[PDB]
Each structure stands twice: as structure tokens, then as C-alpha cells.
Amino acid sequence: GMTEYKLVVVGAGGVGKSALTIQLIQNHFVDEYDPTIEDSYRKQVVIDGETCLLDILDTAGQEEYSAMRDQYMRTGEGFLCVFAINNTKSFEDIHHYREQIKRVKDSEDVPMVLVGNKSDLPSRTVDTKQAQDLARSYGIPFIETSAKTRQGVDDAFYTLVREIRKHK
Ligand SMILES: C[C@H](Oc1ccnc(-c2noc([C@@]3(C)CCCc4sc(N)c(C#N)c43)n2)n1)[C@@H]1CCC[N@H+]1C
Ligand SMILES: Nc1nc2c(ncn2[C@@H]2O[C@H](COP(=O)(O)OP(=O)(O)O)[C@@H](O)[C@H]2O)c(=O)[nH]1
Ligand SMILES: [Mg+2]
Numbered sequence: 722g723m724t725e726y727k728l729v730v731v732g733a734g735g736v737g738k739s740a741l742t743i744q745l746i747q748n749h750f751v752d753e754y755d756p757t758i759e760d761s762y763r764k765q766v767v768i769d770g771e772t773c774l775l776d777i778l779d780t781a782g783q784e785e786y787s788a789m790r791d792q793y794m795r796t797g798e799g800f801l802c803v804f805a806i807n808n809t810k811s812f813e814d815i816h817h818y819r820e821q822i823k824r825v826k827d828s829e830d831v832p833m834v835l836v837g838n839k840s841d842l843p844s845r846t847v848d849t850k851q852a853q854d855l856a857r858s859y860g861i862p863f864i865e866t867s868a869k870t871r872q873g874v875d876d877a878f879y880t881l882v883r884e885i886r887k888h889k
């Protein structure tokens with residue numbers, strides 16, 4: 722049977738979670754997507770020759786620590802933690818997202834990739850070295866992406882699938 726992988730995209734508002742998800746789903750850059758829409762989207766993709774079914778949860782909206790929201794995020798098997806390379810605050814937020822994922826998954830070994838998005842822009846404020854070093858601190862991959870140009874998009878999502886497989 723076709724394996725389904727439940728992937729969850731997290732990070733500060735405005736970093737490009739929806740744009741990255743849409744690039745994977747539609748193969749199109751969408752510069753405008755209602756910031757409040759949290760939804761999940763499926764697509765069949767061939768990864769290392771194996772057709773699998775990706776179920777992407779593009780998170781959005783208000784920070785809330787109800788049991789219900791915890792259970793919704795706990796359905797994720799792997800997480801993309803996204804910041805934007807021209808937004809220092811979004812990078813400084815990453816550790817909070819990482820903390821909450823560890824808590825809801827009750828594991829210090831959750832499949833996860835650090836994603837530095839908007840790599841097409843010249844306004845960089847987060848050094849690549851600092852991001853690489855944070856991924857090194859957490860023992861996870863770091864992928865540079867652009868939802869605008871498609872840079873790194875498959876690398877980010879497909880790496881997460883490979884991490885889930887290894888974890889299994
Ligand atoms: C960085 C923060 O801001 C926001 C803003 C929006 N969301 C968050 C946020 N943190 O974790 C999560 C997720 C979705 C991540 C996956 C696991 C779980 S489990 C659960 N219940 C979640 C929730 N809500 C989450 N989202 N944080 C700063 C710093 C603290 C105050 N705050 C202003
Ligand atoms: N240049 C550029 N803009 C991007 C990129 N990804 C998203 N954006 C823009 O960043 C803003 C927020 O994107 P959105 O997908 O709504 O982010 P979300 O709140 O994390 O879902 C919008 O103005 C998008 O056009 C990217 O890789 N490059
Ligand atoms: Mg969005």
C-alpha cells in the first residue's frame with residue numbers, strides 16, 4: 722500500500738509557510754494567501770522512486786495550548802520549522818516551536834528540518850552560518866528555500882520524509 726506521511730509546517734506568521742506548501746501542491750508561487758487559513762493538503766509524489774502520499778498541514782493563526790490543539794499537532798510525523806532569512810525575529814522564535822514540538826511528541830527525537838525561506842531576497846539579516854549552527858545544535862538538517870523560485874522546496878519536504886523513514 723501507499724504510505725502516507727503527515728508533515729506539519731510551523732513558524733512565525735509571514736515567513737512563507739503557505740507559499741512553500743502551495744509551491745509543493747500547485748507548482749506555482751502564490752504571493753498572497755490569507756494568513757489566517759490553517760489547512761491540510763495532500764499530494765502524491767515520487768521520492769526515491771517510491772510513490773507516497775504527503776499530507777501537509779500548513780499552520781496558521783493564534784498560539785493556543787489547549788488539549789485539542791496539542792492533539793492536532795501531535796498527528797504530525799515530521800515538522801518543518803521555517804524562518805525567513807530577512808527576519809531576525811522569526812529566527813529567534815525557532816527554539817519556541819522546537820520546544821513545543823518536543824513537548825507534544827514527548828520525544829527529543831522528532832523528525833524535523835530547519836528551513837530558511839526567502840533565499841531569493843537580498844535583504845538578509847540571518848547569516849547562513851548561524852542557521853547552519855542552530856541546525857547542528859539540534860542535530861537536524863538545514864535547507865535554504867525560496868517559495869518564489871522553488872529553490873530547496875523538494876529538498877525540504879523530501880528530506881523530512883527521509884527523516885521519518887529513518888525514525889521508523
Ligand atoms: C513564538 C511565539 O509565537 C507564536 C505565535 C504563533 N504560534 C506559536 C506556536 N508555538 O508552537 C506552535 C505550534 C503550532 C508548533 C507545533 C507544536 C504545537 S503544540 C501547540 N499547542 C501549538 C500551538 N499553538 C504548536 N505555534 N508561537 C512567541 C513566543 C512565546 C510567546 N509568543 C508571542
Ligand atoms: N520573495 C519572497 N517572498 C516570499 C517567499 N515566501 C513567501 N513570501 C512572501 O511572504 C509573505 C508571507 O507569505 P505567506 O506564505 O503568507 O506566509 P505564512 O504566514 O508563513 O503562511 C507574502 O507577502 C509572500 O508573498 C519567498 O520565498 N520569497
Ligand atoms: Mg499562511
